[PDB]
Design an enzyme around this catalytic site. Structure first.
Site, PDB file in Angstrom:
ATOM      1  CD  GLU B  35       8.913 -28.115 -14.812  1.00  0.00           C
ATOM      2  OE1 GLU B  35       8.890 -28.473 -13.615  1.00  0.00           O
ATOM      3  OE2 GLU B  35       7.888 -27.802 -15.446  1.00  0.00           O
ATOM      4  CG  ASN B  46       3.051 -33.073  -6.622  1.00  0.00           C
ATOM      5  OD1 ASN B  46       3.176 -31.860  -6.808  1.00  0.00           O
ATOM      6  ND2 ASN B  46       3.763 -33.980  -7.304  1.00  0.00           N
ATOM      7  CG  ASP B  49      -0.937 -36.687  -7.713  1.00  0.00           C
ATOM      8  OD1 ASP B  49       0.072 -36.360  -7.045  1.00  0.00           O
ATOM      9  OD2 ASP B  49      -0.940 -36.647  -8.956  1.00  0.00           O
ATOM     10  CB  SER B  51       2.527 -38.016  -8.509  1.00  0.00           C
ATOM     11  OG  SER B  51       2.019 -36.695  -8.562  1.00  0.00           O
ATOM     12  CG  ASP B  53       6.509 -33.200 -10.615  1.00  0.00           C
ATOM     13  OD1 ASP B  53       5.882 -33.603 -11.613  1.00  0.00           O
ATOM     14  OD2 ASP B  53       5.950 -32.591  -9.688  1.00  0.00           O
ATOM     15  CG  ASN B  60       3.804 -36.482 -11.970  1.00  0.00           C
ATOM     16  OD1 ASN B  60       3.020 -37.429 -11.996  1.00  0.00           O
ATOM     17  ND2 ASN B  60       3.883 -35.648 -10.943  1.00  0.00           N
TER      18      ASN B  60
HETATM   19 CL   LIG Z   1       5.455 -34.361 -16.521  1.00  0.00          CL
END
Ligand SMILES: [Cl-]
Ligand SMILES: [Cl-]
Ligand SMILES: [Cl-]
Ligand SMILES: [Cl-]
Ligand SMILES: [Cl-]
Ligand code: NA
Ligand code: NA
Ligand code: NA
Ligand SMILES: [Ru+3]
Ligand SMILES: [Ru+3]
Lengths: 130, 130
Positions: B35, B46, B49, B51, B53, B60
């Site tokens: 990750e 991103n 959308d 969002s 992380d 997220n």
């Molecule tokens: Cl997640």
């Protein structure tokens, strides 16, 4: 602060939560676990009524604590909501007790209804010596 | 902060992660590695959308934490995504426990499934004395 499981159980038991208005220590453990992850710094806004849930028990700014941001509010615990974001949880314990003295008890918290009510919750106090 | 491998294995083990919902310490390690490279400060925006992380597990902001800028958000860890960028990963671990209690468990992170699921991950913990 993120309490450790057994550390929170002993802290809550020391402050008289075990058995309070019928509520077992395990059920307080479960509530806190799903409300905050045992994190005194958890917070959660509610866009439906522009209130915010505060602290290790996610206590709401509409009825229980004053955050100076919430319309139509009352302060039934007579606490600044920021008092429920503190590493020391004596104030949050006092306000959770005050919440559950109302008729519906621990049912006040939806997450308790969905995640704890009628479920086995022994996992929360097993091995803590409480 | 960028954790050293065993440093993270000891930290995660101390925070109760070994076996949590049947998830091995080794699998949490493999999740963190793919990750974020073990980096508590990692963020991934991103533009699709809108969002982001966050942190060492790349949790997220549409589903799990509030960063106040993601549409369609639900804050299920009741947590500020800022707490997911701390050197102290205690808030992050508690939120990651909330993620894997949903029905998909660790399968929520598509990278874990592409890079870790059904594979040998013993190399992430060995030599660490955990
Ligand atoms: Cl997640
Ligand atoms: Cl409440
Ligand atoms: Cl939920
Ligand atoms: Cl292969
Ligand atoms: Cl070893
Ligand atoms: Na929020
Ligand atoms: Na207090
Ligand atoms: Na949580
Ligand atoms: Ru019900
Ligand atoms: Ru015991």
């Amino acid at each position: 602060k993120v309490f450790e499981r057994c550390e929170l159980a002993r802290t809550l038991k020391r402050l008289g939560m075990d058995g309070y208005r019928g509520i077992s220590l395990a059920n307080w453990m479960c509530l806190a676990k799903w409300e905050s992850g045992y994190n005194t710094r958890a917070t959660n806004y509610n866009a439906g009524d522009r209130s915010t849930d505060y602290g290790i028990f996610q206590i709401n700014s509409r009825y229980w604590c004053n955050d100076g941001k919430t319309p139509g509010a009352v302060n039934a615990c007579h606490l600044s909501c920021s008092a429920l974001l503190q590493d020391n949880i004596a104030d949050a314990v006092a306000c959770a007790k005050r919440v559950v003295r109302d008729p519906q008890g621990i049912r006040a918290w939806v997450a308790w209804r969905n995640r704890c009510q009628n479920r086995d919750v022994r996992q929360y106090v097993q091995g803590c010596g409480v």
